[PDB]
Amino acid sequence: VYSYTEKKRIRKDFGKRPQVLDVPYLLSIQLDSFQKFIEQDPEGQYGLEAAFRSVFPIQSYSGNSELQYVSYRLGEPVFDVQECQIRGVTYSAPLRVKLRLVIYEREAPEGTVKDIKEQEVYMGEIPLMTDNGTFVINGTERVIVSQLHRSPGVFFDSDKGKTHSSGKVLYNARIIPYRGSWLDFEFDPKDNLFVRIDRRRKLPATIILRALNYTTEQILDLFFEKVIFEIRDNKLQMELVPERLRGETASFDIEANGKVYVEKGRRITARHIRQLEKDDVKLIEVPVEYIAGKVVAKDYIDESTGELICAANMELSLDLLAKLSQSGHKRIETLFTNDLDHGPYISETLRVDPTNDRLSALVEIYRMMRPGEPPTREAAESLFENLFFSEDRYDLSAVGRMKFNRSLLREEIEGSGILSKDDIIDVMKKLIDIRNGKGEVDDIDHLGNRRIRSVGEMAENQFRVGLVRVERAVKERLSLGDLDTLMPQDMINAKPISAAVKEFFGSSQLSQFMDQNNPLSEITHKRRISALGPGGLTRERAGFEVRDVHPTHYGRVCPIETPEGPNIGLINSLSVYAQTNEYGFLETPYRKVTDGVVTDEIHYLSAIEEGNYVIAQANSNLDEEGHFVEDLVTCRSKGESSLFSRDQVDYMDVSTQQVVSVGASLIPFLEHDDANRALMGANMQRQAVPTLRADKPLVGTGMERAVAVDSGVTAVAKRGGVVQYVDASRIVIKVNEDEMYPGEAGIDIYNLTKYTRSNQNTCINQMPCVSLGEPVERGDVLADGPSTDLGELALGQNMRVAFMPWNGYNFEDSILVSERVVQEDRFTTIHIQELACVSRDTKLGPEEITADIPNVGEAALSKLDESGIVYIGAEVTGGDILVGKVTPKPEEKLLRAIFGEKASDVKDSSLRVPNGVSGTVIDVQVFTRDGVEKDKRALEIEEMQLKQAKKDLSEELQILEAGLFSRIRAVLVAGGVEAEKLDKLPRDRWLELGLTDEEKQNQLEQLAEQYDELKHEFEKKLEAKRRKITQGDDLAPGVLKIVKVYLAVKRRIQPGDKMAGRHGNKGVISKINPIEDMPYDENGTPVDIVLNPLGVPSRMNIGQILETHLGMAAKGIGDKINAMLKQQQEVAKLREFIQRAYDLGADVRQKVDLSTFSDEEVMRLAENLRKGMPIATPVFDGAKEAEIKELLKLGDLPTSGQIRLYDGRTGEQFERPVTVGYMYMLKLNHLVDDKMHARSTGSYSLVTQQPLGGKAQFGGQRFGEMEVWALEAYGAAYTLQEMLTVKSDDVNGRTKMYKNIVDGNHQMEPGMPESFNVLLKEIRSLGINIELEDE
Amino acid sequence: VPLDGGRFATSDLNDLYRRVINRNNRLKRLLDLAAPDIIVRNEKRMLQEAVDALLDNGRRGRAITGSNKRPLKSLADMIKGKQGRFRQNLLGKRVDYSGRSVITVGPYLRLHQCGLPKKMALELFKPFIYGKLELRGLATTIKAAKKMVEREEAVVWDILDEVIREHPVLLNRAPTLHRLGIQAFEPVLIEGKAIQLHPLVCAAYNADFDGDQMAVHVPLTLEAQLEARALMMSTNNILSPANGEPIIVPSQDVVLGLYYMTRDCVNAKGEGMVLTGPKEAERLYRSGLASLHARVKVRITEYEKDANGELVAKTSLKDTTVGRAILWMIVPKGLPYSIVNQALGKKAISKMLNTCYRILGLKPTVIFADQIMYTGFAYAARSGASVGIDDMVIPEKKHEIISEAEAEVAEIQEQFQSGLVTAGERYNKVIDIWAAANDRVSKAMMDNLQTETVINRDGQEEKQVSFNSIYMMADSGARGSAAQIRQLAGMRGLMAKPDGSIIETPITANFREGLNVLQYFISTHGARKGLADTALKTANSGYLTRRLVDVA
DNA sequence: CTCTGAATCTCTTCCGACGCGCCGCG
RNA sequence: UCCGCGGCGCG
DNA sequence: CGGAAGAGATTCAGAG
Ligand SMILES: [Mg+2]
């Protein structure tokens, strides 16, 4: 079953995997983010209200004055979208906020406020986003891409190698907040704990340990455990468990219960440990020498005077033992002193402490943060609390604490943004665990650490910055607030936040201009992921780990489509079925699999969790009942892929399509070609340009419909119904009874878009593709845009191509082209330029736009109006007058202009046509300042603008008023029906049917007002519109009126253009060849494009071969249809023929027939097949060799696809059969007329007497440095002198040479390079003395 | 700079000078007042820092910014840096009388000449036009000549043609790498909008026709013209300064044409006659009464230089094919006939050129190269060496070879699940057995493809060389090598992890058949690694070249 | 005890291809 | 109205 | 920001 709209033409499809999921909305990211950013959600949940409740309320510090938030509202935009783009203003909308101001009583803080104030306050405006996901700033379109940055959390890096190369690895711990100072933990070869704050100097951890109010004993108890000793008479007996004897050599005779288990020196394996564990006693006896290097834990003090017997982190000596045993504190708590399980780094870390006191630590960090300042206790405390306790200057998002708890193997989900003490204690503990060896570090390229942002949150961040700035200002003002002396907006300013958001949208490394040439670029330039901008790395901070792709990128980030050159892998694209998780991670779908059956339902899975499960390869032979015909299948695990059993996998991939990007999915037969070749093919395909008339590619992928529909570059039926009127300007559609709204629905109007300048000087256009009075179905196309036809995407065209070397004209890759294509004008393209003339109000005479110009001929005025502006439709060429703008150059001194002079000379400043380009006037735009004279031509242009601006409204009201008149007809059925005056009295005029009933007139009079209201809204819409056209335009100061003109040029193919296909085949057209010499077949048709077969071996792209055979098959059906339809045969002949055509597949899900179809439906379907058969192909499940072979059998072509050919010049057989067929050719917008350029003598620069640069100015090329050394490599000397002295720098030399050359005496003069004289000046401008010397 | 209205975005130096002069004015004013020491030393401090920043900025903390957000420029910035004065205005400076365009082939020119589009030709030589117009006196003032050349009257194209006849020009390639990147050509007027190049120069330029663009320059004086025709010329540069091997070696198409030209199937129509000269062989081929190549005895005359400065003729009845003789028809006198009896590969033709230069001077070598290029295009167009999908014959035994391979991988796995072996040992030996399988499949497909053609041979049967298009393109040395066909037809080897570790599962598919997702993903790994490698390597290469050319 | 000194760790600086085209903002 | 920054693209 | 380099402060370090 198919809709009638699909029945325009049905596409042959292949493939055996039955799809289940539909392609989602291709603009979900931007739409969801912007919708979430502006909507009335209670409790915020990442919204504007969240930022408001963060910044609010505002309280005067001890001033007992409170400003508290109420609500915000937005009004309608004052302008439209289209004329807003035309004019130049942004498409913003006002921000209306209600603020509540109260002042507490000075006698009672908690007491009630004396008064309450509330009012609506306006501040700034914010840009709006159109359904296509666009933005408007200054009469243009700009788009913000999404940023990709590391998530706020913890990282652990190896950094093996460079430092102390003949040494083992290091380790480091990093914490990055969402907004705040960085904090770094790292190691050194001497193995000490050091901390660094914000890339500053290296400091030990002990300073912050003590500054966190910890004593040494507390710290050592934290990082270490106890080993207890006793002052005992017999050798100080002591207690040991074998857990600390795991893997040590016996430094003692192992004895217990008076029985030695093993002697000194024997390594204690597991067997001896277990032997100890049988009747495991702990108290044993050891000699004394072992404690020589061992370190006490606590701080034992004397009892005679209180002196400290031994402090922490120092070892013990025999005298210490003796004079602590003299005191009798038997319990001796010592340090564990492990080597391979608990590295005692804390010991020497505390030993190299510079200080020992909290106040000293505060003073030290005080001088570390700000050098050269007097140490103050309170200032140090204030800065320390303003780094990790201050919720203002430091904070974490909920995602930050989420990953923090996940990384530390914690279980808490929700806490506070600010950090604590025990958390960084745990960071210590985990870091020292890692240094011990156990545990595992984390990489960076893994996507479970990668976070994606979008427009809403960065907009919220910039807006929050603006609000905190203005809040600072408001509090500063409120410090001197008075008793209810003002209304609560004099303290607020709309300037700062408006300026901030305007700068963010205007100037940003994320708000790039958008390349508007074709819908493919439209859809692929929005779903783009970048890693640049603030908070991320730059273009050359990139190593190699960021550059290469990672296994986690599968199904979430396209690996094959990315720009190449200066930046690779930094501008990666997002997948086709991927989506954004709630937190800000990526997600990809999977099919749930039961014990032996796969369910239809799906799950969305994050990046971190997928390692816990195993996923099967997509193109597995799933059985009819959801089983696997094999008992074993390859499946990708957390690490790699491996063949697993029948019952090991639990999730199935949705389809083969979810591996690549949108642009990549459009390349047919992709699986047969190399990665880099496909990459360059996609990079070219994104750069195509629509031609004059589009035509569907013969080989498609099935994705054309989705991208065409979702990208709003075409007219879509908001409601289905019946066509009523169609035109090249507007479309009128009848609404069906079920779909119309109960309250005065009426009909819909669709305004088309005509020829208009695009962002890339291309012709955006909309052609209707619907006949008259056709039933249209809900959500379907009506009018085709550029490079689109009948609702499918069509960039290039289809050519008859052959692969053969011919007379060297295809030497490397040069594309030979037949004359027939330019004969048909089938690659003809259009460009639209833009020329601007300003009218400033400067001194020495305000500028005039008069038609009077001196020193010119009458040829200009022959093509000019008395206003000076060109008439519409003039065949102007380069260097022609367009607008006539001219600027002029007591009682005794002012009259000399007549006595000794003649007249003031007014200087011409006419904007001419740039040289080299033709064109024709298609549109003139004139803007005027507030209160300036409007010349004649400007008056009619608004008059033509005026009368059309009221016809469309009148046409709208005429249809709009029709609905209310049916209400008259339905009520007033019976009565006096007029024979002839039924129409002379129109559908409205029935309350004047001579006499009228006493009750019928009531409804007639009642509705008479509502027509007037419809007239009233007609009046206001007229009155509002007539003001917009009549009102001026605020501009930059000084200028008075804008003169915008438009040109249209018809660009043809000429030798030098840049041609390309869909499999990476580059090329430039070398020679255009007349028809007679082209090769041709026995049938009589010629061939159009001839290529070089040598591309296939070197660059392995066999895919372009396989499509070419299909092109013959696609035409091979079509011409056979064409052969039969030329003679009027009965319909069932083609009906069975087309039936077998859409039959003849291996195993497909298409399963279409023709019996159910009406005869006229089949006939109109036949004529759309006059050009061939559109054939679909999935990216990986495409057609194999066999079914291509048997498809040609239905045609009348040889089985091999291999055809002998006849020569165009000599006309004989070729003793090798050649391969011909079709191939999809598009055109790039890299022409030759815009590149070829030269100068002989033009302008020069001011600071140096050197020629200009660039083609826009009449400038030349740059003699690069590199060819300099190249030139003396040959014995050439004079040219080096001659090129850079007499042609570039010397001023007297060239003029003599210029005068000398016109006489033939070619001679050179040395001169002296003035640039060197420029050099000596500034080096003189310092204390340096330098000059020339003796001659 | 005069900008819109009374606004002028002037240089930062003006701001620095204004700041320091205001500072000095305030300071010298306040010392008149006998001010207290604290404020005067504060002013002297801030003046000192101001003038220090004026001399050099960035050497102090909190470098003073400029207009909005960036550190202002200084004199030290004006002297040093890539944006400084040296490397943008002294070592390299923009020059007039130049131009730029895009390249095409136009493979019918001579090696000592190049084309040039008509409008460019008119634009470049305007002073020469004025001079010659004065010489014939058809104009009087500069204005008359200017309006005549702007009208593009037909009476000036003949002068324009006259001033070209031997007036040379220069060409340039923007990433100029070595000394051959600059050459000179005798220009010839051509219609169009693009530059035309002789094909044999693009190899030296390493300039593919993908859309590279050239620059042009015009020598002016007699010194310049003689200097250009002496050393800038393309003719007198045929050996690379890096190595004595030549630099006009043919690249892609003429080599294919000649390689196809000198191959002989054992049986073909027109086999087994005798001819007395290459001329009648050419006539017979144009008649179509004999094959392009078949074993034919011919009478060949050859010259040789045994005499010290003189040539000696001698005749014989050699045995060869027709194509060898018809190629011999154009070869110069010196070389012996034995120089063409081989298959004329890439190395062979390079040796041809080298020997011709070493024995027969310079000019005959040049004309020989030009004429062999002409014949190469002619017979390459005549051949019709197309490509076809049916060409790539896949070997059949490879399937059961693979089947055996997973048999031993299952076997080694089931030893490993019994504690017999460790992970590393099994890793190494599965790599070994997979590599051995690759060797076997590669050798099998090579022997299947290499000589598949068979013929009855005027009788029972005979086995000879192949005639597949892929093979003849491969062994010609034109494009690709053995590994390309190995990748395409046979197994695509085995790829490694990004770190460098090898994947245990090899690429068991090939481009002619379909490809599953994961192996394509690994191929993406490899390709992205290579592209990143070259993209990063370019900058280091250029920088190293700069330092080395500076040091010596 | 005081070196002199011989590393040794710290801190700062200088640098990172070429050429062109297009667009935007002070 | 021609100087400087940023971004994109091409080789 | 990786790396080199180079100057400089530090810090044992055997000879005393
Ligand atoms: Mg190139």
Tab-separated table of C-alpha atoms in Angstrom, chain B residues 270-412:
chain	number	residue	atom	x	y	z
B	270	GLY	CA	48.842	-11.896	-40.531
B	271	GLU	CA	51.397	-14.242	-38.976
B	272	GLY	CA	54.309	-15.606	-40.971
B	273	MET	CA	55.421	-13.324	-43.806
B	274	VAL	CA	58.522	-11.290	-44.651
B	275	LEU	CA	58.864	-7.542	-45.209
B	276	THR	CA	61.754	-5.351	-46.335
B	277	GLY	CA	61.063	-2.233	-44.271
B	278	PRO	CA	59.061	-0.624	-41.474
B	279	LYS	CA	57.275	1.647	-43.956
B	280	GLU	CA	55.404	-1.184	-45.653
B	281	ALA	CA	54.646	-2.673	-42.229
B	282	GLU	CA	52.982	0.608	-41.270
B	283	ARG	CA	51.097	0.514	-44.569
B	284	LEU	CA	49.970	-3.061	-43.935
B	285	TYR	CA	48.744	-2.233	-40.435
B	286	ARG	CA	46.773	0.731	-41.744
B	287	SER	CA	45.319	-1.625	-44.350
B	288	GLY	CA	44.052	-3.841	-41.533
B	289	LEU	CA	45.279	-6.970	-43.332
B	290	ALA	CA	47.667	-7.868	-40.494
B	291	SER	CA	47.423	-7.863	-36.720
B	292	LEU	CA	49.016	-5.158	-34.606
B	293	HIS	CA	51.546	-7.729	-33.406
B	294	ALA	CA	52.657	-11.056	-34.878
B	295	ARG	CA	56.014	-12.726	-35.450
B	296	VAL	CA	57.319	-11.469	-38.801
B	297	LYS	CA	60.815	-11.562	-40.276
B	298	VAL	CA	61.851	-8.120	-41.537
B	299	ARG	CA	64.882	-6.496	-43.165
B	300	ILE	CA	66.168	-3.870	-40.736
B	301	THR	CA	68.967	-1.383	-41.382
B	302	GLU	CA	70.783	0.013	-38.357
B	303	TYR	CA	73.570	2.517	-37.779
B	304	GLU	CA	76.429	2.425	-35.299
B	305	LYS	CA	79.415	4.578	-34.343
B	306	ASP	CA	82.392	2.178	-34.399
B	307	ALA	CA	84.203	4.789	-36.477
B	308	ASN	CA	85.361	7.673	-34.307
B	309	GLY	CA	82.819	10.228	-35.489
B	310	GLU	CA	81.149	8.352	-38.360
B	311	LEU	CA	78.177	6.014	-38.762
B	312	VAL	CA	78.333	2.604	-40.446
B	313	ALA	CA	75.354	0.867	-42.037
B	314	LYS	CA	74.683	-2.866	-41.974
B	315	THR	CA	71.696	-5.038	-42.845
B	316	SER	CA	70.218	-8.329	-41.664
B	317	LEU	CA	66.985	-10.327	-41.461
B	318	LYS	CA	65.897	-10.040	-37.842
B	319	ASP	CA	63.005	-11.978	-36.322
B	320	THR	CA	60.491	-9.920	-34.349
B	321	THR	CA	56.912	-8.659	-34.450
B	322	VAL	CA	55.465	-5.863	-36.567
B	323	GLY	CA	55.010	-3.461	-33.655
B	324	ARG	CA	58.700	-3.493	-32.799
B	325	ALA	CA	59.562	-2.598	-36.399
B	326	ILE	CA	56.999	0.194	-36.648
B	327	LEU	CA	58.355	1.644	-33.414
B	328	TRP	CA	61.874	1.278	-34.838
B	329	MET	CA	60.727	3.395	-37.795
B	330	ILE	CA	61.037	6.619	-35.766
B	331	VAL	CA	64.044	5.830	-33.541
B	332	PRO	CA	67.174	7.930	-34.283
B	333	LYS	CA	70.223	6.539	-36.033
B	334	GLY	CA	72.712	5.831	-33.263
B	335	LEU	CA	71.053	3.222	-31.076
B	336	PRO	CA	71.410	-0.462	-32.033
B	337	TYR	CA	68.343	-2.483	-32.937
B	338	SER	CA	68.863	-4.730	-29.893
B	339	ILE	CA	67.606	-1.838	-27.741
B	340	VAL	CA	63.921	-2.597	-28.474
B	341	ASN	CA	63.753	-6.409	-28.487
B	342	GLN	CA	62.617	-6.513	-24.844
B	343	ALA	CA	59.161	-5.677	-23.463
B	344	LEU	CA	59.868	-1.928	-23.019
B	345	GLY	CA	59.039	-1.457	-19.357
B	346	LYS	CA	59.376	1.645	-17.211
B	347	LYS	CA	62.992	0.884	-16.328
B	348	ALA	CA	63.561	-0.041	-19.971
B	349	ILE	CA	62.307	3.291	-21.329
B	350	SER	CA	64.272	5.225	-18.708
B	351	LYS	CA	67.396	3.382	-19.845
B	352	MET	CA	66.382	4.141	-23.446
B	353	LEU	CA	66.361	7.860	-22.712
B	354	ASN	CA	69.595	7.760	-20.712
B	355	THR	CA	71.515	5.838	-23.383
B	356	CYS	CA	70.162	8.055	-26.164
B	357	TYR	CA	71.325	11.163	-24.314
B	358	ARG	CA	74.710	9.693	-23.431
B	359	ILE	CA	75.518	8.580	-26.990
B	360	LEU	CA	73.743	11.033	-29.337
B	361	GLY	CA	74.185	14.432	-27.701
B	362	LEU	CA	71.170	16.532	-26.740
B	363	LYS	CA	68.897	17.580	-29.628
B	364	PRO	CA	68.074	14.154	-31.183
B	365	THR	CA	67.247	12.895	-27.697
B	366	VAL	CA	64.758	15.748	-27.254
B	367	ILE	CA	63.030	15.243	-30.597
B	368	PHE	CA	62.994	11.486	-29.963
B	369	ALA	CA	61.206	12.061	-26.653
B	370	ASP	CA	58.632	14.373	-28.231
B	371	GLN	CA	57.892	12.012	-31.103
B	372	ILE	CA	57.663	8.949	-28.865
B	373	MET	CA	55.148	10.837	-26.713
B	374	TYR	CA	53.095	11.579	-29.836
B	375	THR	CA	53.139	7.938	-30.928
B	376	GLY	CA	52.357	6.804	-27.390
B	377	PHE	CA	49.151	8.825	-27.265
B	378	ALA	CA	48.274	7.792	-30.824
B	379	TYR	CA	48.515	4.050	-30.257
B	380	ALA	CA	47.134	4.263	-26.715
B	381	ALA	CA	44.011	5.833	-28.192
B	382	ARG	CA	44.088	3.171	-30.906
B	383	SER	CA	44.381	0.287	-28.426
B	384	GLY	CA	41.332	0.729	-26.218
B	385	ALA	CA	42.602	-0.779	-22.959
B	386	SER	CA	39.345	-0.600	-21.030
B	387	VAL	CA	38.612	-2.173	-17.645
B	388	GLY	CA	35.892	-4.680	-16.823
B	389	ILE	CA	34.441	-6.253	-13.710
B	390	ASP	CA	34.778	-9.722	-15.255
B	391	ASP	CA	38.547	-9.208	-15.545
B	392	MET	CA	39.259	-9.907	-11.862
B	393	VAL	CA	39.181	-13.700	-11.774
B	394	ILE	CA	38.971	-14.867	-8.162
B	395	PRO	CA	40.867	-18.086	-7.333
B	396	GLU	CA	38.676	-20.940	-6.140
B	397	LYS	CA	41.043	-22.902	-3.876
B	398	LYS	CA	41.293	-19.866	-1.585
B	399	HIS	CA	37.929	-20.717	-0.013
B	400	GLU	CA	39.016	-24.109	1.286
B	401	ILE	CA	42.391	-22.571	2.172
B	402	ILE	CA	40.468	-20.244	4.469
B	403	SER	CA	38.388	-23.192	5.727
B	404	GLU	CA	41.603	-24.939	6.722
B	405	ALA	CA	42.726	-21.712	8.401
B	406	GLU	CA	39.770	-21.560	10.758
B	407	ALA	CA	40.239	-25.303	11.295
B	408	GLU	CA	43.656	-24.687	12.847
B	409	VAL	CA	42.429	-21.596	14.717
B	410	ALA	CA	39.701	-23.717	16.324
B	411	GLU	CA	42.326	-26.358	17.103
B	412	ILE	CA	44.726	-23.908	18.750
